Amino acid sequence: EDALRGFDALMATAGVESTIVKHAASGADSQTLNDELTRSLQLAHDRWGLGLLHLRHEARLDRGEDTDVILLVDGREVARLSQGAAAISATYETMRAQNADDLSDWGVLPEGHRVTLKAGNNQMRVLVEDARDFETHWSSERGGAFVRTWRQGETLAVEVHRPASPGTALAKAAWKAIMSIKDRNFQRELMERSNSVGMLGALLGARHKDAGRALERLPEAHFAVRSTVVRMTGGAQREFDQWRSMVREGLDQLDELQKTTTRHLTEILRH
Amino acid sequence: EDALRGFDALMATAGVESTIVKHAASGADSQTLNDELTRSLQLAHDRWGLGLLHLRHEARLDRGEDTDVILLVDGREVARLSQGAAAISATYETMRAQNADDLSDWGVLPEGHRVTLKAGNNQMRVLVEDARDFETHWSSERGGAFVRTWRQGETLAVEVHRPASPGTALAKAAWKAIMSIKDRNFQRELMERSNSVGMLGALLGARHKDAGRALERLPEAHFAVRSTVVRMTGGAQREFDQWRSMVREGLDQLDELQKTTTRHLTEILRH
């Protein structure tokens, strides 16, 4: 029964408007349900930013009962939702790798000479206009963000991410939930307790918890949103102006989405 | 019996030091003989410059008698040497295609955005240093030659060719063979006849021919050498200086080889 809501909560960690409950009860074709799951999962991963973009993430339904949702990588069974979110997180963590900096060391395209951008400006104009495949190293974009870009065939793509952590997501949403209390005496008491237990600790103590009893069961606890990817397949792929436009779009979507998730997080913080 | 010498003459049209007679009579393994044939043929094609570099040219021996040599393209039987050189030429001609100019329209790498180099200088430095695959359009090199370059994986390659024709090859070699007569009276007579029949016509009339009786049977009559390719797979592939060096090398080899073939041609002209 409960697999549908699990997956929806998972997706909800990112701006993923899953409608699986509106089709699972509609008798939708199993292959179309799986297809939609998979597209949702892939988008989810673009948002989470694990640097696992080099993999095929697929999602399936089970044939037996109690019907669960299988997470697969490259057609191999990896996880199931019934394992709880934390296990899925650790599973994905064993897959991710980081370089000398706190950044993904992987790269998207099959291995082999990722572009050492170094410096320069017309550096990439050549690549957008006159190049088959390539992928850049990370660009240390000054605006508090890191970005890289690649193209595969007729598809051009850019990703942007800020180094984040569910803990920063929770600090923001928890402080914001404390500010939204609108009960200065109770708020005062909780702020006073935050001095020793942090924002989250105080908020947990307010709801008759010992160490986040329901917290560990909920997804948002780990793998917050920290990245986004903009891609286009189509004539404009080499326009370059389109490329700056993608970058702008990506920054805008990153900021909007992480603020949106803090909004939803803060919301559930007060229930 | 005669297939070995046919192939050797074919190869001899280009600087191809075939030794097939030293191994066919040595009992060499059939697969190694075929392998060597194939490598020779591919080099031959680099020299001839048909713009068919996008194909797999392979050469095989026959199992029956009288054992002939099969020319294959992409594992399909295309021609056999027993067909005479002219037929092989026409066969290859149906394969070649030329653009708005007298140049091959094909390109090497699978189709899709060959680089419109247009103008510019650091245009390509980006590509040698920071690019996976690509291939340029032809470069109108001022030095009476056209050149283009591409890379496939860890292999970087450049080709250079001059627009030529076996007829120009024969005009040069024939005039040179007339000058090498060293019999000013006979030479005078043949030069006088050239006025109406061309150099080749005069030289044919000197050897009791009507329209090149043996000429049509010999390879050099068609598909002269007009191109060469320099390729490297190895660290230096992105050095760029190595790239200029390849270009220099290619021009040098083109000039040396076409002069060498004129030498050998002229030689057979006087027998």
XYZ file of C-alpha atoms in Angstrom:
542
model
C 0.000 0.000 0.000
C 2.505 2.530 1.322
C 5.064 2.476 -1.522
C 3.301 5.187 -3.539
C 3.517 7.771 -0.746
C 7.116 6.847 0.007
C 8.169 7.566 -3.580
C 6.114 10.765 -3.651
C 7.839 12.007 -0.472
C 11.195 11.093 -1.995
C 10.411 13.092 -5.118
C 9.011 15.884 -2.953
C 12.534 16.408 -1.608
C 12.952 18.109 -5.010
C 10.510 20.098 -7.080
C 9.018 16.872 -8.486
C 5.254 17.090 -9.030
C 4.640 13.358 -8.845
C 1.056 12.291 -9.633
C 1.600 8.546 -9.168
C -1.427 8.224 -6.900
C -3.656 9.632 -9.671
C -2.564 6.891 -12.074
C -1.933 3.869 -9.832
C -5.613 4.047 -8.859
C -6.590 4.724 -12.503
C -5.358 1.382 -13.847
C -2.640 3.022 -15.930
C -0.451 0.737 -18.004
C 2.440 -0.645 -15.965
C 5.029 0.292 -18.582
C 3.779 3.898 -18.712
C 3.825 4.098 -14.915
C 7.401 2.789 -14.889
C 8.398 5.207 -17.647
C 7.003 8.157 -15.688
C 8.694 6.953 -12.513
C 12.008 6.776 -14.345
C 11.766 10.266 -15.821
C 10.848 11.603 -12.396
C 13.753 9.824 -10.730
C 16.255 11.097 -13.285
C 15.063 14.663 -12.768
C 15.274 14.127 -9.020
C 18.907 13.146 -9.453
C 19.672 16.191 -11.543
C 18.399 18.197 -8.582
C 20.206 16.301 -5.862
C 23.592 16.666 -7.515
C 25.329 13.496 -6.574
C 27.625 13.631 -9.588
C 26.167 10.299 -10.659
C 24.921 11.702 -13.956
C 27.023 9.083 -15.673
C 24.544 6.367 -14.681
C 21.181 5.091 -15.928
C 18.685 5.492 -13.132
C 15.474 3.589 -13.690
C 12.501 2.948 -11.431
C 10.166 -0.032 -11.588
C 7.120 -1.377 -9.802
C 7.030 -4.806 -8.243
C 4.807 -7.635 -9.446
C 4.286 -9.244 -6.030
C 2.924 -7.814 -2.804
C 3.263 -5.683 -0.930
C 4.066 -3.935 -4.180
C 7.189 -1.801 -3.774
C 9.196 0.474 -6.068
C 12.618 -0.699 -7.242
C 15.464 1.739 -7.876
C 17.814 0.428 -10.542
C 21.123 1.629 -11.919
C 22.087 0.458 -15.385
C 19.349 -2.168 -15.233
C 20.626 -3.737 -12.026
C 18.519 -3.678 -8.883
C 20.098 -1.211 -6.435
C 17.567 -0.277 -3.762
C 13.890 -0.485 -2.911
C 11.829 2.244 -1.255
C 10.706 -0.018 1.610
C 14.286 0.258 2.900
C 13.686 3.728 4.240
C 15.314 6.877 2.973
C 18.522 6.727 5.043
C 19.552 3.367 3.575
C 18.952 4.680 0.073
C 21.106 7.660 0.990
C 24.024 5.546 2.219
C 23.684 3.353 -0.871
C 24.032 6.392 -3.101
C 26.870 7.681 -0.949
C 28.984 4.623 -1.668
C 28.608 5.576 -5.334
C 29.583 9.177 -5.162
C 33.183 10.345 -5.104
C 34.745 13.746 -4.466
C 37.984 15.279 -5.727
C 40.612 17.368 -3.923
C 37.762 19.807 -3.292
C 34.277 19.090 -2.000
C 33.102 18.431 -5.557
C 32.190 15.422 -7.631
C 35.192 13.830 -9.281
C 33.232 11.883 -11.850
C 32.299 13.761 -14.981
C 29.415 12.858 -17.209
C 30.800 11.597 -20.498
C 32.873 8.385 -20.677
C 36.249 8.988 -19.135
C 38.919 10.769 -21.017
C 40.182 14.315 -21.110
C 37.641 16.467 -19.422
C 38.433 19.991 -20.483
C 40.967 21.714 -18.228
C 39.308 25.067 -18.818
C 41.980 26.912 -16.829
C 41.503 30.531 -17.895
C 40.419 32.339 -21.007
C 37.161 33.537 -22.523
C 36.961 32.444 -26.165
C 38.068 29.135 -24.640
C 34.561 27.731 -24.917
C 33.068 29.742 -27.761
C 35.010 27.356 -30.014
C 33.427 24.395 -28.255
C 29.816 25.512 -28.487
C 30.230 26.515 -32.092
C 32.610 23.868 -33.446
C 32.842 20.659 -31.440
C 31.305 17.247 -31.312
C 31.511 16.053 -27.711
C 33.365 17.415 -24.683
C 32.892 18.203 -21.041
C 34.542 20.920 -18.989
C 35.991 20.653 -15.557
C 34.091 22.542 -12.893
C 34.059 26.291 -13.283
C 34.622 28.233 -10.047
C 31.847 30.689 -10.787
C 32.331 33.666 -8.479
C 28.617 33.952 -7.630
C 28.809 31.339 -4.883
C 28.218 28.492 -7.329
C 30.117 25.879 -9.302
C 29.222 25.011 -12.896
C 30.253 22.707 -15.684
C 28.959 21.862 -19.124
C 29.146 19.149 -21.746
C 27.506 18.021 -24.912
C 26.553 14.571 -26.105
C 25.603 14.427 -29.761
C 22.978 17.022 -30.555
C 22.338 17.605 -26.837
C 23.994 20.431 -24.950
C 23.758 20.541 -21.182
C 24.921 22.652 -18.233
C 24.753 21.896 -14.552
C 25.114 24.262 -11.634
C 25.284 23.342 -7.995
C 26.097 24.916 -4.698
C 27.847 22.746 -2.086
C 25.036 21.988 0.346
C 23.926 19.452 2.956
C 20.502 18.448 4.349
C 21.773 19.915 7.606
C 22.045 23.379 6.117
C 18.580 22.860 4.602
C 17.275 21.992 8.035
C 19.026 24.854 9.831
C 17.390 27.326 7.440
C 13.948 25.720 7.542
C 14.080 25.276 11.333
C 15.093 28.854 12.078
C 12.369 29.937 9.650
C 9.837 27.652 11.351
C 10.785 29.116 14.725
C 10.228 32.600 13.323
C 6.828 31.545 11.962
C 5.534 30.405 15.363
C 3.779 33.713 16.129
C 3.724 32.956 19.918
C 6.527 35.018 21.432
C 6.477 33.226 24.811
C 6.640 29.679 23.417
C 9.051 30.901 20.744
C 11.176 32.478 23.463
C 11.281 29.175 25.356
C 12.335 27.227 22.251
C 14.997 29.776 21.273
C 16.396 29.475 24.773
C 16.588 25.685 24.390
C 18.256 26.053 20.963
C 21.290 27.411 22.807
C 22.167 23.837 23.776
C 20.338 21.596 21.270
C 20.301 23.585 18.029
C 17.196 24.759 16.180
C 16.197 21.301 15.150
C 16.662 19.852 18.620
C 14.410 22.499 20.134
C 11.784 21.941 17.451
C 11.888 18.190 18.043
C 11.488 18.615 21.793
C 8.413 20.740 21.136
C 6.684 17.783 19.396
C 7.241 15.052 22.023
C 10.278 13.470 20.320
C 13.512 12.094 21.810
C 15.790 12.235 18.754
C 13.424 12.832 15.843
C 11.315 9.677 16.070
C 9.495 10.337 12.793
C 12.383 12.467 11.496
C 14.584 9.527 10.545
C 11.704 8.049 8.536
C 11.243 11.145 6.441
C 13.274 11.760 3.296
C 14.030 15.482 3.654
C 16.402 14.540 6.494
C 19.096 13.704 3.923
C 20.077 14.456 0.318
C 18.674 17.945 0.055
C 18.545 19.761 -3.298
C 21.819 21.365 -4.316
C 22.075 21.263 -8.157
C 20.158 21.710 -11.403
C 20.782 20.944 -15.062
C 19.534 22.735 -18.163
C 19.743 20.902 -21.442
C 18.649 21.509 -25.003
C 18.599 19.301 -28.068
C 17.857 21.405 -31.098
C 19.213 23.890 -33.572
C 19.962 26.526 -30.989
C 22.438 24.043 -29.440
C 25.404 25.951 -30.918
C 24.044 29.509 -30.641
C 26.277 30.301 -27.602
C 23.911 33.100 -26.633
C 21.526 30.253 -25.882
C 24.325 28.955 -23.670
C 24.574 32.066 -21.497
C 20.788 31.892 -21.414
C 20.893 28.320 -20.111
C 23.361 29.392 -17.424
C 21.105 32.244 -16.327
C 18.174 29.841 -16.343
C 20.061 27.330 -14.250
C 21.067 29.809 -11.587
C 17.475 31.081 -11.444
C 16.049 27.560 -11.127
C 18.582 26.553 -8.502
C 17.759 29.522 -6.296
C 14.019 29.234 -6.806
C 13.957 25.498 -6.131
C 16.104 25.487 -3.005
C 13.966 28.311 -1.624
C 10.855 26.302 -2.542
C 12.149 23.227 -0.723
C 12.979 25.329 2.321
C 9.381 26.580 2.157
C 7.907 23.061 2.082
C 10.405 21.886 4.685
C 9.599 24.742 7.069
C 5.915 23.940 6.495
C 6.256 20.349 7.644
C 8.477 21.617 10.486
C 5.367 23.055 12.173
C 3.263 19.885 12.130
C 49.460 -17.266 -60.787
C 49.319 -13.647 -61.931
C 47.329 -12.117 -59.044
C 50.414 -11.390 -56.928
C 52.038 -9.191 -59.583
C 48.762 -7.427 -60.312
C 48.392 -6.370 -56.673
C 52.059 -5.379 -56.480
C 51.671 -3.143 -59.558
C 48.538 -1.650 -58.019
C 50.399 -0.851 -54.815
C 53.350 0.389 -56.864
C 51.111 3.204 -58.112
C 51.874 4.572 -54.621
C 54.979 4.307 -52.501
C 53.899 0.847 -51.289
C 56.829 -1.540 -50.807
C 54.789 -4.707 -51.192
C 56.720 -7.937 -50.528
C 53.817 -10.324 -51.171
C 55.893 -12.476 -53.511
C 58.437 -13.065 -50.716
C 55.744 -14.486 -48.433
C 53.295 -16.189 -50.812
C 56.165 -18.473 -51.846
C 57.274 -18.809 -48.192
C 54.095 -20.527 -46.994
C 53.135 -17.597 -44.780
C 49.939 -17.930 -42.781
C 46.907 -16.914 -44.831
C 45.561 -14.618 -42.120
C 48.902 -12.789 -41.833
C 49.075 -12.420 -45.613
C 45.544 -10.993 -45.636
C 46.370 -8.674 -42.740
C 49.419 -7.323 -44.575
C 47.418 -6.923 -47.774
C 44.805 -4.927 -45.889
C 47.293 -2.578 -44.244
C 48.936 -2.028 -47.614
C 45.621 -1.317 -49.311
C 44.565 1.172 -46.647
C 47.849 3.042 -47.007
C 47.406 2.976 -50.772
C 44.044 4.659 -50.319
C 45.474 7.323 -48.063
C 47.820 8.106 -50.944
C 45.261 8.048 -53.721
C 42.960 10.503 -51.986
C 39.565 9.365 -53.052
C 37.893 10.851 -49.990
C 36.724 7.351 -49.118
C 38.524 7.391 -45.779
C 35.176 6.771 -44.155
C 35.217 3.148 -45.331
C 36.835 -0.112 -44.215
C 39.011 -1.346 -47.035
C 40.109 -4.934 -46.636
C 41.932 -7.286 -48.982
C 41.666 -11.065 -49.021
C 43.062 -14.012 -50.930
C 40.862 -16.535 -52.662
C 40.596 -20.180 -51.647
C 39.970 -21.548 -55.149
C 42.002 -21.239 -58.325
C 43.214 -19.338 -60.081
C 43.725 -17.669 -56.732
C 42.844 -13.976 -56.970
C 42.833 -11.062 -54.526
C 39.484 -9.699 -53.347
C 38.991 -6.018 -52.535
C 36.317 -5.550 -49.894
C 34.638 -2.514 -48.394
C 33.071 -2.911 -44.973
C 33.348 -6.682 -45.311
C 31.411 -6.828 -48.567
C 33.076 -8.037 -51.743
C 33.603 -5.029 -54.033
C 36.159 -5.897 -56.704
C 38.767 -8.470 -57.636
C 42.156 -7.745 -59.191
C 41.530 -10.028 -62.188
C 39.082 -7.362 -63.393
C 41.878 -5.125 -64.568
C 42.753 -1.766 -63.113
C 40.311 0.377 -65.125
C 37.268 -1.497 -63.808
C 38.525 -1.103 -60.257
C 38.940 2.594 -60.981
C 35.381 3.043 -62.257
C 34.106 1.035 -59.290
C 35.839 3.408 -56.902
C 34.636 6.372 -58.931
C 31.005 5.485 -58.326
C 31.851 5.755 -54.626
C 33.543 9.085 -54.596
C 31.654 12.364 -54.526
C 32.784 15.962 -54.962
C 31.381 19.203 -53.562
C 30.864 22.602 -55.208
C 34.625 22.532 -55.770
C 36.757 19.732 -57.164
C 37.119 18.278 -53.668
C 35.742 15.333 -51.766
C 32.415 16.081 -50.140
C 32.516 13.196 -47.711
C 34.405 13.805 -44.509
C 35.898 11.092 -42.385
C 33.963 10.920 -39.138
C 30.269 9.920 -39.081
C 28.197 12.704 -40.525
C 27.370 15.717 -38.504
C 28.806 19.185 -38.208
C 32.166 19.164 -39.834
C 33.917 22.251 -38.582
C 33.233 25.339 -40.698
C 36.699 26.683 -39.972
C 35.989 29.939 -41.813
C 38.746 32.248 -40.575
C 40.702 32.705 -37.397
C 43.894 31.334 -35.887
C 43.239 30.207 -32.309
C 40.231 28.573 -33.977
C 41.889 25.170 -33.839
C 44.289 25.517 -30.927
C 41.205 24.936 -28.759
C 40.433 21.771 -30.696
C 43.856 20.169 -30.478
C 44.151 21.008 -26.820
C 40.586 20.572 -25.555
C 38.303 18.450 -27.716
C 37.162 14.900 -28.045
C 36.279 14.334 -31.696
C 35.873 16.738 -34.616
C 36.823 17.188 -38.222
C 37.457 20.410 -40.102
C 36.269 21.356 -43.515
C 38.997 21.616 -46.117
C 41.523 24.353 -45.538
C 42.468 26.332 -48.661
C 46.159 26.257 -47.852
C 47.837 28.903 -49.997
C 50.804 26.670 -50.903
C 48.963 25.001 -53.774
C 47.448 22.373 -51.486
C 44.250 21.609 -49.611
C 44.264 20.185 -46.083
C 41.902 19.028 -43.395
C 42.231 17.362 -40.028
C 40.224 15.345 -37.543
C 40.624 13.251 -34.471
C 38.998 9.997 -33.471
C 39.536 9.070 -29.847
C 43.208 9.195 -28.974
C 44.145 9.385 -32.669
C 44.845 12.683 -34.379
C 45.167 12.797 -38.140
C 45.774 15.289 -40.956
C 45.464 14.801 -44.673
C 46.837 16.943 -47.461
C 46.165 16.558 -51.138
C 46.680 18.435 -54.334
C 43.978 18.130 -57.018
C 45.605 15.809 -59.539
C 44.781 13.318 -62.295
C 46.677 10.352 -63.803
C 46.779 12.454 -66.957
C 48.869 15.127 -65.290
C 51.064 12.347 -63.870
C 51.518 11.002 -67.367
C 52.169 14.386 -68.983
C 54.993 15.002 -66.502
C 56.475 11.512 -66.751
C 56.153 11.462 -70.557
C 57.811 14.829 -71.101
C 60.512 13.685 -68.674
C 60.894 10.382 -70.538
C 61.236 12.272 -73.814
C 63.956 14.410 -72.249
C 65.747 11.283 -71.010
C 66.010 9.742 -74.488
C 69.543 11.057 -75.121
C 69.151 10.650 -78.943
C 68.480 14.132 -80.297
C 67.382 12.940 -83.763
C 64.859 10.352 -82.546
C 63.836 12.737 -79.768
C 63.367 15.465 -82.363
C 61.114 13.183 -84.418
C 58.967 12.289 -81.395
C 58.678 15.911 -80.238
C 57.505 16.802 -83.721
C 54.818 14.103 -83.526
C 53.760 15.320 -80.052
C 52.453 18.451 -81.767
C 49.427 16.439 -82.897
C 49.235 13.427 -80.543
C 50.532 14.712 -77.208
C 53.587 13.410 -75.363
C 51.994 10.127 -74.528
C 50.744 9.540 -78.057
C 54.219 10.070 -79.479
C 55.742 7.762 -76.879
C 53.165 5.082 -77.656
C 53.819 5.318 -81.388
C 57.513 4.800 -80.684
C 56.782 1.364 -79.129
C 54.591 -0.154 -81.879
C 51.243 0.622 -80.199
C 47.950 1.843 -81.694
C 46.294 3.318 -78.592
C 48.394 2.030 -75.701
C 47.851 -1.709 -76.127
C 49.581 -2.604 -72.857
C 48.838 0.843 -71.398
C 45.216 0.091 -70.554
C 46.326 -3.034 -68.678
C 48.701 -1.154 -66.439
C 47.544 0.503 -63.228
C 49.482 3.785 -63.384
C 47.145 4.818 -66.221
C 44.536 5.874 -63.643
C 44.241 6.906 -59.987
C 47.615 8.539 -59.576
C 48.861 9.629 -56.139
C 47.485 12.958 -54.978
C 47.153 12.860 -51.143
C 48.812 11.745 -47.916
C 47.764 11.411 -44.289
C 49.830 11.746 -41.127
C 48.384 10.363 -37.940
C 49.534 9.901 -34.376
C 48.033 8.076 -31.427
C 49.934 8.986 -28.310
C 50.544 11.610 -25.688
C 51.803 14.195 -28.120
C 48.332 14.092 -29.744
C 47.379 17.416 -28.114
C 50.776 19.156 -28.238
C 49.708 21.392 -31.189
C 53.358 21.930 -32.062
C 53.237 18.261 -33.002
C 50.332 19.285 -35.222
C 52.272 21.867 -37.229
C 54.969 19.206 -37.395
C 52.524 16.696 -38.874
C 51.461 19.278 -41.454
C 55.068 19.936 -42.450
C 55.634 16.192 -42.612
C 52.592 15.701 -44.792
C 53.557 18.345 -47.307
C 57.079 16.889 -47.455
C 55.785 13.341 -47.976
C 53.281 14.424 -50.600
C 55.923 16.184 -52.669
C 58.497 13.440 -52.246
C 56.054 10.665 -53.109
C 54.513 12.251 -56.190
C 58.019 12.982 -57.469
C 58.965 9.364 -56.713
C 55.980 8.043 -58.659
C 56.831 10.310 -61.577
C 60.337 8.819 -61.420
C 59.073 5.221 -61.550
C 56.482 6.154 -64.161
C 59.040 7.851 -66.413
C 61.226 4.761 -65.952
C 58.591 2.386 -67.273
C 57.846 4.956 -70.004
C 61.151 4.024 -71.676
C 60.589 0.264 -71.834
